[PDB]
Design a binder for this molecule. Structure first.
Ligand SMILES: COc1ccc(C(=O)Nc2ccc(Oc3ccc(N(C(=O)[C@H]4CC[C@H](C)CC4)C(C)C)c(C(=O)O)c3)cc2)cc1
Ligand SMILES: [Mg+2]
Ligand SMILES: [Mg+2]
Length: 560
């Protein structure tokens, strides 16, 4: 069927939308070419609409069915619990879109009578009505990027009302948080921290006699997901031991919300109908991960790739296997692509076999190597800094609910660019405004967290190790990419950042306390006379296990 059907009504904005990087004095110290930075708006909605609207083609085969049964067999060991309205409420982000039934996120979190009673009525409705399509809202997403040799059309987000979202958590939060790992095991990407992902990728790469790997980009994955995929996805959920009400909610949610439904713009107009994956539901990440894994695992058998190992994060996929030669590898890959195409997962960028791990990009990142103080090689996760820097520039020119720069500092703490630039720039600004102690929100694997800047040293030590504060001698390729990026965006050269860093470092030390800890560890690279970096006490008590359990992008999840 058609992923979408449109009535003609437009995808409209909720309020005024900014596209150009604002007028301010602090962003310019980060990057001078501000005209290269832009945010997507609803004005480009029609372009995305054209791209995501098409008739899907899907032909299943024995390999697909064999893998599905294998997945259900593992799903069968799971026992999911029903969340209480109170538990489900606490997971709701403070800034979650308000309900159109007289209440918002705050009321939900406060368990206000008006919110709880309506949520309860939505739940009962899910137990009684098994057919009526649930209404959703479709909006153009606002995201920041840097122009390319031009601009990207805004993506479309589709989500149900706040009440329905709370009900989703009640019935499926435990499922989407535990099942993926039980079904895919080591292949489930979100169970890893950046350091662990690298370890998994490096070990997997070293386990092959002659390794060959590739990233597979599915063209607009969400719209390639068919009604059949969503029901197959549910059949896996149904293998879990579930409470009767959870089982009915999952069944109802599947037919009423997940497989499709009517779209309404921000002005309450009927925009059309969806018959593919909605981006803003609790099962999007889990569902995409399961579906991608299922199709890829089956495609590999069809293509006859030797000893395949998948790493899947939602619609993102990387496959590492045994090489059978250059010609055979390229032929097998093309066979793989055809299999995926039949499963309704056609490629955007055609895949290409890689024989160098560092050249494989997955989750917009790649594994690279550097050296610690003692000169020992260390593997870490990095990525092209273009988007991170553009967004950091934007978040500097104006307030944003989520601080991507903080998230990028945590996930990419070992990188040459995060240390030289993001840390220096943001700590410098925080000092000036005297907000080093204020907690800021950021996202990790879609879930929202509240982080205190001054706790960064501990966090980084725990997630990356002490080597994150001593890495040097980065690879030629990594250095080239960072340098090119800085030249392109008009970002000051290393010398300027070292100077700014020395100054930030000094101010931080004179303040003592945690600030002084930030000064010693985060900026040890800026000074000539190094300081001996020993394990930080608070880094031995950090409860960071819950940070890397599952994916929640689009899930409206908040962890306090
Ligand atoms: C105007 O156009 C331009 C814009 C930008 C640039 C530019 O910055 N180019 C530009 C920026 C970075 C470059 O790579 C470097 C520089 C110093 C390093 N070193 C370090 O100790 C670093 C350790 C990590 C820490 C975070 C920084 C120091 C020493 C070897 C000297 C390392 C490394 O460790 O591999 C790598 C090269 C060119 C050049 C021109
Ligand atoms: Mg894609
Ligand atoms: Mg973990």
């Amino acid at each position: 069927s058609m992923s979408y059907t449109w009535t003609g009504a437009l995808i409209t904005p909720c309020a005024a939308e900014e596209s150009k990087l604002p007028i301010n004095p602090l962003s310019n110290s980060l990057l001078r070419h501000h005209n290269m930075v832009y945010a997507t708006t609803s004005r480009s909605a029609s372009l995305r609409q054209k791209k995501v609207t098409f008739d899907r083609l899907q032909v299943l085969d024995d390999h697909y069915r064999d893998v599905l049964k294998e997945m259900k067999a593992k799903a069968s060991t799971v026992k999911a619990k029903l969340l209480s309205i109170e538990e489900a409420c606490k997971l709701t982000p403070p800034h979650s879109a308000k309900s159109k039934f007289g209440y918002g996120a705050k009321d939900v979190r406060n368990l206000s009578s008006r919110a709880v009673n309506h949520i309860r009525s939505v739940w009962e409705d899910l137990l009684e009505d098994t057919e009526t399509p649930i209404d959703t809202t479709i909006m153009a997403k606002s995201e920041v990027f840097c122009v390319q040799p031009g601009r990207k059309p805004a993506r479309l987000i589709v989500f149900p009302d706040l009440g329905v979202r709370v009900c989703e958590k009640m019935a499926l939060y435990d499922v989407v948080s535990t099942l993926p790992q039980a079904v895919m095991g080591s292949s489930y990407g979100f169970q890893y921290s950046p350091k662990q992902r690298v370890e998994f990728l490096v070990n997997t790469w070293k386990s092959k006699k002659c390794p060959m790997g590739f990233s597979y980009d599915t063209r607009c994955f969400d719209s390639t997901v068919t009604e059949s995929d969503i029901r197959v996805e549910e059949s896996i959920y149904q293998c879990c031991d579930l409470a009767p009400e959870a089982r009915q909610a999952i069944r109802s949610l599947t037919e009423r919300l997940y497989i499709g439904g009517p779209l309404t713009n921000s002005k309450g107009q009927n925009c059309g109908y969806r018959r593919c994956r909605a981006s803003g539901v609790l099962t999007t990440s889990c569902g995409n991960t399961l579906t991608c894994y299922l199709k890829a695992t089956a495609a590999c058998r069809a293509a006859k790739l030797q000893d395949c190992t998948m790493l899947v994060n939602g619609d993102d996929l990387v496959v590492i296997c045994e090489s059978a030669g250059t010609q055979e590898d390229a032929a097998a890959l093309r066979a793989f692509t055809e299999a995926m195409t039949r499963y309704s997962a056609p490629p955007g960028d055609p895949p290409q076999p890689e024989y160098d791990l560092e050249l494989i990009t997955s989750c917009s990142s790649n594994v690279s190597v550097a050296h610690d103080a003692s000169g020992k090689r260390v593997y870490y996760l990095t990525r092209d800094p273009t988007t991170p820097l553009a967004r950091a520039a934007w978040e500097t020119a104006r307030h944003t609910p989520i601080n991507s720069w903080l998230g990028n500092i945590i996930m990419y703490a070992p990188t040459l660019w995060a240390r030289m630039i993001l840390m220096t720039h943001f700590f410098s600004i925080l000092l000036a405004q005297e907000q080093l102690e204020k907690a800021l929100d950021c996202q990790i694997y879609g879930a929202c967290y509240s982080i205190e800047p001054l706790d960064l040293p501990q966090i980084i030590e725990r997630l990356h190790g002490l080597s994150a504060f001593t890495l040097h001698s980065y690879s030629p390729g990594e250095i080239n990419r960072v340098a090119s990026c800085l030249r392109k965006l008009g970002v000051p050269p290393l010398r300027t950042w070292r100077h700014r860093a020395r100054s930030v470092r000094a101010k931080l030390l004179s303040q003592g306390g945690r600030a002084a800890t930030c000064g010693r560890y985060l900026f040890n690279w800026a000074v000539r006379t190094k300081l001996k970096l020993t394990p930080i006490p608070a880094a031995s008590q950090l409860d960071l296990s819950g940070w890397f359990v599952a994916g929640y992008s689009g899930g409206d999840i908040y962890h306090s």
